[PDB]
Structure formats: C-alpha cells, structure tokens
DNA sequence: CGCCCGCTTCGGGGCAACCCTGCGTCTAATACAAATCCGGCAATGGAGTCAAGACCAGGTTCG
C-alpha cells in the first residue's frame, strides 16, 4: 500500500514473493474460518426456539467469528475458542 | 423349425396436492459518542384591538 505510490521501484523477485506472502495470508485466514465454523454451530445450537431461524443464527455467528478472527491475538498464549466464544 | 427386439399393457413406484395421530427461559453488562427531545428565556414583528375622531348624507325637527 505504501509501495503503490512512488515509494520505491519494484524488483521482480521481491515483488512476486511479497505477492505470494500477501496471497498466502488470505488463504490462512480462510483456513482458520473454515476450521472454527463447527464451533459456531455448536454455540448457535442452543439459542433456537424463539423468533429467528436456525440458519440465520448460524450465519450471524459466522459473522461474529469473522470479527473474532479479525481481533484475535495469539501472544496472550490462549486458545482461540475461549476468545471467540464471546464474540459469537 | 427356432430366435431377437421393439410395441404395447399392466404394475409399481413416485410424486403432487390436502389435514393433526400436530400445536420451551437461558451470561450481563460497561464505555462512549452521536442524535434528539425539551425546557426555558430572548430577540422579536406582524396581526389583532380599543378608542378617538373625523367624514358627510339624507331623514328629522324646528324657524
């Protein structure tokens, strides 16, 4: 982003492997989301019985999980599920 | 003389359209910012109001 202005000229190998890292991060993000979808279902399974549909509850839990993997930190050394349960 | 192979015929399955043998309570807040109501003076400025007071015009009374 700070390179897209006239910050620096683009070397070929540096450009292509920084593109590889930038594309790899999104695949890792999607991998984490696709991992914890089951936790989302296991949390949403008990808020039924009033008003909304079960798939709607699951989808809003998915959106909360996207927010949780946005604002998740690992240097506190805790498991992901205890942090994401709150946001879901 | 026997034999394949699609054509027709019925069966069974599959599916589309209607009723009741149908018809649960759930963490719990804080922090903050923006929007909005609203309560109360604080400039009015135009619109209504009272009162005087003048304006003659033609009955009405008097000479």
């Amino acid at each position: 982003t700070e390179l897209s202005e006239r910050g620096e000229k683009l070397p070929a190998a540096q450009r292509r492997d920084m593109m590889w890292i930038c594309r790899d991060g999104d695949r890792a993000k999607n991998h984490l989301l696709e991992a914890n979808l089951r936790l989302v279902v296991s949390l949403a399974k008990r808020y039924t019985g009033r008003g909304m549909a079960f798939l709607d509850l699951i989808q809003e839990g998915n959106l909360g999980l996207i927010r949780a993997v946005e604002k998740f930190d690992y240097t506190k050394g805790y498991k992901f599920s205890t942090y994401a349960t709150w946001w879901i």
Side-chain angles (χ1 to χ4, degrees), chain A residues 1-8 10-88:
Chain A
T1 320
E2 62 198 1
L3 183 60
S4 41
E5 46 106 0
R6 47 102 58 221
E8 214 77 37
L10 266 170
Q14 275 74 17
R15 177 245 196 88
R16 66 188 183 172
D17 82 322
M18 86 177 272
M19 283 316 114
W20 194 88
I21 300 294
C22 161
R23 288 176 267 102
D24 174 76
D26 311 349
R27 308 186 187 97
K29 172 173 191 283
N30 299 302
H31 212 300
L32 204 36
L33 301 148
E34 286 146 356
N36 302 290
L37 288 172
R38 210 177 281 187
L39 153 75
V40 172
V41 183
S42 69
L43 260 163
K45 74 186 274 193
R46 50 202 182 197
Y47 277 125
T48 180
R50 34 172 193 169
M52 283 164 79
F54 182 50
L55 270 171
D56 276 310
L57 300 181
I58 287 176
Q59 264 310 115
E60 298 284 336
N62 296 322
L63 200 148
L65 192 273
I66 299 157
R67 187 62 146 277
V69 77
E70 283 178 350
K71 227 196 161 183
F72 170 71
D73 209 344
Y74 60 92
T75 56
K76 299 197 197 303
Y78 292 126
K79 200 64 76 69
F80 177 77
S81 71
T82 322
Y83 187 70
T85 309
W86 281 92
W87 292 85
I88 286 162

